Amino acid sequence: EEYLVHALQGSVSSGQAHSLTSLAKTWAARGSRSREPSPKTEDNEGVLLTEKLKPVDYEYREEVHWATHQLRLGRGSFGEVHRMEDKQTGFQCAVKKVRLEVFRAEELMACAGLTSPRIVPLYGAVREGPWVNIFMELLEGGSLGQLVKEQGCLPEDRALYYLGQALEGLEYLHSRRILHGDVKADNVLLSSDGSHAALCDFGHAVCLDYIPGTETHMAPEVVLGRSCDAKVDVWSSCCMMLHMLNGCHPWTQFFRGPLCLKIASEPPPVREIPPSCAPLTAQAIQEGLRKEPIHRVSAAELGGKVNRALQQVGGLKSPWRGEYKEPRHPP
Numbered sequence: 001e002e003y004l005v006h007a008l009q010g011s012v013s014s015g016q017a018h019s020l021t022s023l024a025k026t027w028a029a030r031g032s033r034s035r036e037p038s039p040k041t042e043d044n045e046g047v048l049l050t051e052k053l054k055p056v057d058y059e060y061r062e063e064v065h066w067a068t069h070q071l072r073l074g075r076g077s078f079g080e081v082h083r084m085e086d087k088q089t090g091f092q093c094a095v096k097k098v099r100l101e102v103f104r105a106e107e108l109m110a111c112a113g114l115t116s117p118r119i120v121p122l123y124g125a126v127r128e129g130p131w132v133n134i135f136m137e138l139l140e141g142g143s144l145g146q147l148v149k150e151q152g153c154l155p156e157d158r159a160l161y162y163l164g165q166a167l168e169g170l171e172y173l174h175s176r177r178i179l180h181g182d183v184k185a186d187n188v189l190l191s192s193d194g195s196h197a198a199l200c201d202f203g204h205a206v207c208l209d210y211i212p213g214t215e216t217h218m219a220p221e222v223v224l225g226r227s228c229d230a231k232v233d234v235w236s237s238c239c240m241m242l243h244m245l246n247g248c249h250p251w252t253q254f255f256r257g258p259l260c261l262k263i264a265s266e267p268p269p270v271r272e273i274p275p276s277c278a279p280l281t282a283q284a285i286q287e288g289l290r291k292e293p294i295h296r297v298s299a300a301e302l303g304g305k306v307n308r309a310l311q312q313v314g315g316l317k318s319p320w321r322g323e324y325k326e327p328r329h330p331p
C-alpha cells in the first residue's frame with residue numbers, strides 16, 4: 001500500500017477503488033495535522049473511477065477542468081453538494097466539497113467500487129489543497145426527506161416500498177462489514193419518476209468510533225455509550241419508517257431536551273406506529289425497534305418482512321407525488 005500511495009500522491013489518475021481508498025487514508029491523517037504555509041500552486045491529487053470524469057495532464061481543478069452550475073442540491077453531513085459538469089466530457093454529476101480537517105476516509109471506503117442499484121455510485125474524489133471534492137452519480141428526483149416534507153407523509157405502500165429499497169442497500173453494506181451510520185429520509189435519493197431509491201452520504205460510516213447522526217434516529221446502545229454494530233442502521237431505518245408514515249421524527253412530539261436520555265429510558269417508540277397500519281407493517285417496525293441489538297432483526301430479515309408487508313397491503317399502487325396528507329399533530 002505504502003508504494004501505491006507514494007505513486008498516486010501529487011497526481012489525479014483514472015484508476016480503481018483500492019487506489020482512491022489508500023489515498024483517502026492519507027487525506028484523513030493530513031486533516032489531523034496542523035495547517036502549514038500553503039504553496040503558490042495547491043496540491044492536486046485523487047482518483048476518478050469513471051470515464052465520464054477525465055483528468056487532463058494528471059490535473060482535475062475546479063473552474064479549469066470542471067465547474068458547478070445552478071444552486072446547491074443541499075447540505076451533506078460535512079459539506080455542501082452541487083451539480084457539476086466536466087468541461088472536456090460534458091457529463092454532469094454531484095460534488096460534495098469537504099474541508100480536509102473534517103474529512104473521514106470512510107466517506108470513500110464505505111461506497112468506493114460498490115455495485116448496488118440501492119447505493120449512489122461513487123465517481124471518484126479529488127483533493128485541491130485543504131478541499132476534498134467527492135464525485136457521485138446525480139439522481140434527479142431529490143431526497144426522500146424532500147418528498148416527505150412536500151407530501152406531509154407517505155401512504156403505507158410507498159413508505160414500505162422505499163424502506164424496502166433502503167434495507168436492500170443496508171444488507172449489501174452489512175455483508176461487507178459497512179455501517180452507514182446516518183440512515184434517514186434526507187440520505188435516501190429518488191430517481192426522477194420516484195421508482196428507484198439509493199443510500200447516499202457516508203459521512204458517519206464505520207468499517208467493522210461511531211459518530212452519531214440525528215438524535216431522533218439513534219439506537220439505545222449508541223445513546224448509552226455501549227459499542228455498536230450494523231444493527232444501529234436497522235433501528236434508524238424504522239425511525240425513518242415512522243417519519244414517512246407520521247410526517248414527523250419519532251420522540252419529538254412527546255419529549256423535549258436532549259432526547260438521548262428518553263431513548264435510553266423509554267420503551268421503544270412502537271406507540272408512534274399508526275393504528276391504521278397492516279399487521280405485518282406493525283410487526284416489521286416492532287422487530288426493527290428492539291432496544292437490545294442482539295434481538296433486533298438484521299437488515300436482510302427486516303427486508304423480508306417489509307417485502308411481505310408490502311404484498312399484504314396490495315403492492316405499490318399509491319401515485320408518485322400524490323396529495324398532501326396532514327402530518328400527525330402533537331398530543
Ligand SMILES: COc1ncccc1Nc1nccc(-c2cc(C#N)c3c(c2)[C@](C)(CO)CN3)n1
Pocket residue numbers: 073074075076077081094096120136137138139140141142143186187189200201202
Ligand atoms: C436534482 O438533484 C437533487 N436535488 C435535490 C437533492 C438531491 C439531488 N440529487 C443528488 N444526486 C446525487 C447526490 C446527491 C446528494 C449527495 C449527498 C452526499 N454525500 C447528500 C445529499 C445529496 C443531501 C440530501 C444534500 O442535502 C445530503 N447529502 N443528491
